[PDB]
Amino acid sequence: VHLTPEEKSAVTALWGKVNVDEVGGEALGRLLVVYPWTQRFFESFGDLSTPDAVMGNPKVKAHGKKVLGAFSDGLAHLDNLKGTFATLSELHCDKLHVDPENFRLLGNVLVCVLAHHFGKEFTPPVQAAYQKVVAGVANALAHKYH
Amino acid sequence: VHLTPEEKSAVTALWGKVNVDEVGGEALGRLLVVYPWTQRFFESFGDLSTPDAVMGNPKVKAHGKKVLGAFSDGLAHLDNLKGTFATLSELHCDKLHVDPENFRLLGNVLVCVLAHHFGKEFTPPVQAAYQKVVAGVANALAHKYH
Amino acid sequence: VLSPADKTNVKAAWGKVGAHAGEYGAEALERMFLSFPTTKTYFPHFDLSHGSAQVKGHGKKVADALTNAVAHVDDMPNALSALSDLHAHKLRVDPVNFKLLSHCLLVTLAAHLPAEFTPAVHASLDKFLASVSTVLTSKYR
Amino acid sequence: VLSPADKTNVKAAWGKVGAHAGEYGAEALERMFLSFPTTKTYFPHFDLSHGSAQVKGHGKKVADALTNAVAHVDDMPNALSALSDLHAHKLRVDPVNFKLLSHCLLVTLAAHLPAEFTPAVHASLDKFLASVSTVLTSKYR
Ligand code: HEM
Ligand code: HEM
Ligand code: HEM
Ligand code: HEM
Known part of the structure; x- marks a missing residue:
């Protein structure tokens, strides 16, 4: 991160609005639906064989808040994105072996979810701010693959 | 990098053998041929319209040694891959705008070129050592995109 | 693919x-x-x-x-x-660029059509945009 | 594509x-x-x-x-x-895995056939391996 003041202003001001019980899960769910391979990783979670079954699965919404959790952690800890995420990187890297590109994918589906939720309030400059952030985050988790 | 002693032993011991006037250029060339979009970046270099014309182009072999140069620099500076490459990252990032994935591609074509050159001496463990390194290098250059 | x-x-x-x-x-x-x-x-x-x-x-x-x-x-x-021809021959567009646009396209459908932009349509649209992109990079292939 | x-x-x-x-x-x-x-x-x-x-x-x-x-x-x-079906349905292989294998395949052709492994054949082979991979990930598509 850098995040200029105005970008900062824009990331922080949306995140305040965000329904953290229900946004994290709309994005984990969208991932499993949009990118089916990733459901490899949640066989433990129940029926995902239809996306309706993915989007009202309680483990799926259970987990997705954990995931927005970590984002809230990173989003306002941008100075050491890397410090913050090490433990998590370790878990997904040399523990669940999740290829780092799904980290961009979640990132981007997250950007989709926010755009769907905020509509017009999600202007291109704000999106631009968020891209950097989701990037920083995908890069922080994937750092123990090195 | 980490590079264990034995991996270290293996990267260093091949690199000594490597014809640095002619290996860098076989890999820049292979890139332009294998991944044609990348020739966007060398319109200044002459006829590349046929791969024969790519592989006996003197600017192409001229440039490719520069590129192995930087690798020799990184390969035995693995402790701050990041320091070493900053200037170069700046040049390719916010100066030629080369998307970082072509950095993996070169990396991998480089691994191809070495395999072709060393044959059997390029065993899977040595390849494994080199992958990490080419990685480290692609990641170092792409670090000013952040 | 793209299904019925x-x-x-x-x-x-x-x-x-x-x-x-x-x-x-x-x-x-x-x-x-x-x-x-x-x-x-x-x-x-x-x-x-x-x-x-x-x-x-x-x-x-x-x-x-x-x-x-x-x-x-x-x-x-x-x-x-x-x-x-135009994008892959003549313009030599980096195929990674097709992934970034496609994504801004979905963010723009989404940002506009939230009734319609179901998880499943999001999926259909993605897949569709992928097919278009595969087509416009297929003279690299 | 894959040309004559x-x-x-x-x-x-x-x-x-x-x-x-x-x-x-x-x-x-x-x-x-x-x-x-x-x-x-x-x-x-x-x-x-x-x-x-x-x-x-x-x-x-x-x-x-x-x-x-x-x-x-x-x-x-x-x-x-x-x-x-087997790789995308049943095994759910991450499509990125098709790129890493394909690459080890070329490194292995190369490491074996240096007469044959011309820049242009390297290219044909890449493209071919890409087509195979696109096929085996196309029920994600
Ligand atoms: C920005 C990216 C991501 C973040 C913030 C993230 C965050 C987390 C957190 C908060 C947990 C568990 C915390 C705990 O157990 O105490 C976790 C677990 C896990 N993540 Fe993610 N994750 C991310 C990307 C991914 C992706 C792309 C997948 C791969 C499909 C993935 C698969 C998993 C799995 C299955 C677990 C379950 C861990 C377990 O209980 O064994 N994650 N993630
Ligand atoms: C590991 C990856 C790479 C390394 C080590 C590398 C290294 C270098 C070095 C040594 C130079 C110029 C040094 C100088 O001008 O003094 C350079 C220039 C350049 N690189 Fe690379 N490069 C890499 C990847 C790429 C890739 C993937 C492309 C994109 C297709 C690219 C495109 C260029 C271009 C066209 C220049 C010309 C600079 C100019 O004269 O304006 N490079 N690279
Ligand atoms: C689904 C993806 C996209 C579609 C359907 C698409 C379609 C088009 C169309 C319809 C035109 C002009 C056709 C005409 O000349 O009448 C065009 C032009 C062009 N596209 Fe794309 N395109 C796509 C993605 C991209 C991407 C990824 C890039 C690179 C960032 C790109 C770069 C260009 C360039 C630069 C031109 C020429 C603009 C000019 O010189 O006037 N396009 N595109
Ligand atoms: C060009 C790419 C590849 C080809 C042609 C290919 C072909 C095959 C074939 C022929 C089989 C078994 C067919 C049978 O059951 O008779 C198989 C099995 C399998 N493939 Fe692939 N495959 C490819 C890439 C991959 C990759 C990328 C992965 C993931 C790293 C993968 C994971 C598997 C798994 C795990 C099985 C089942 C092994 C078992 O359980 O016995 N394959 N593949």
Whole structure:
């Protein structure tokens, strides 16, 4: 991160609005639906064989808040994105072996979810701010693959 | 990098053998041929319209040694891959705008070129050592995109 | 692939975008230029600034090629025939650029059509945009 | 795509690999497991160690599916029909894994056939391996 003041202003001001019980899960769910391979990783979670079954699965919404959790952690800890995420990187890297590109994918589906939720309030400059952030985050988790 | 002693032993011991006037250029060339979009970046270099014309182009072999140069620099500076490459990252990032994935591609074509050159001496463990390194290098250059 | 239902959802979210398709297409383009600044390289003869007419009018073109893909979806290869040539031969667009645009396109459908932008349509649209992109990079293939 | 000449080069580097195709295929697999350790996840019932019979015999299978692709190249979709299902439905292989294997395959052709492994054949082979991979991930598409 850098995040200029105005970008900062824009990331922080949306995140305040965000329904953290229900946004994290709309994005984990969208991932499993949009990118089916990733459901490899949640066989433990129940029926995902239809996306309706993915989007009202309680483990799926259970987990997705954990995931927005970590984002809230990173989003306002941008100075050491890397410090913050090490433990998590370790878990997904040399523990669940999740290829780092799904980290961009979640990132981007997250950007989709926010755009769907905020509509017009999600202007291109704000999106631009968020891209950097989701990037920083995908890069922080994937750092123990090195 | 980490590079264990034995991996270290293996990267260093091949690199000594490597014809640095002619290996860098076989890999820049292979890139332009294998991944044609990348020739966007060398319109200044002459006829590349046929791969024969790519592989006996003197600017192409001229440039490719520069590129192995930087690798020799990184390969035995693995402790701050990041320091070493900053200037170069700046040049390719916010100066030629080369998307970082072509950095993996070169990396991998480089691994191809070495395999072709060393044959059997390029065993899977040595390849494994080199992958990490080419990685480290692609990641170092792409670090000013952040 | 694109299944009978992908093709139905894509037939339909597009239905629902109608006349604004070019306005959206111009917005998706702006987003990309903004979010992924590397893409700006292709467009050095454009004013890439907000109210730019050139991007406005470009949006129109992207949007139209997308509609020509929806309508001939079961034959995009012959239909996007010449844009394939133009982007991969003549322009040498980095195929990674197709992934960033496609994404700004979904963020723009989403940001516009939240009733319609179901998880499953999101999926159909993704897949569709992937097919279009595969087509326009297939003379590298 | 794959042009009359890609198809000629691919017809031919394969010609030249002959009987060792399975030995190479077993080597490409080892390389990948070694170079990209994340791939190891699919194979938890394998001994992934050097002289492993299971990988040996797997090599044979990959190699054979590759040869069935060369011979029916102008119809890989119907031919790799069931491996498409098996890898994308049933196994849910991360499509990025197709790029790492394909690469170990070229490193293994290269490491074996340096006369044959011209810049242009390297290109034909890449493109071919891409088509195979696109096919085996196309029920995600
Ligand atoms: C920005 C990216 C991501 C973040 C913030 C993230 C965050 C987390 C957190 C908060 C947990 C568990 C915390 C705990 O157990 O105490 C977790 C677990 C896990 N993540 Fe993610 N994750 C991300 C990407 C991914 C992706 C792309 C996948 C791969 C499909 C993935 C698969 C998993 C799995 C299955 C677990 C379950 C861990 C377990 O209980 O064994 N994650 N993630
Ligand atoms: C590991 C990756 C790479 C390394 C080590 C590398 C290294 C270098 C070095 C040594 C130079 C110029 C040094 C100088 O001008 O003093 C350079 C320039 C350049 N690189 Fe690379 N490069 C890499 C990847 C790429 C890739 C993937 C492309 C994109 C297709 C690319 C495109 C260029 C271009 C066209 C220049 C010319 C600079 C100029 O004269 O304006 N490079 N690279
Ligand atoms: C689904 C993806 C896209 C679609 C359908 C698409 C379609 C089009 C169309 C319809 C035109 C002009 C056709 C005509 O000349 O009448 C065009 C032009 C062009 N596209 Fe794309 N395109 C796509 C993605 C991209 C991407 C990824 C890039 C690179 C960032 C790109 C760069 C260009 C360039 C620079 C031109 C020429 C603009 C000019 O010089 O006037 N396009 N595109
Ligand atoms: C060009 C790419 C590849 C080819 C042609 C290929 C072909 C095959 C074939 C022929 C088999 C078995 C067919 C049968 O059951 O008779 C197989 C099995 C399998 N493949 Fe692939 N495959 C490829 C890439 C991959 C990759 C990228 C992965 C993931 C790292 C993968 C994971 C598997 C798994 C785990 C099995 C099942 C092994 C078992 O359980 O016995 N394959 N493949």
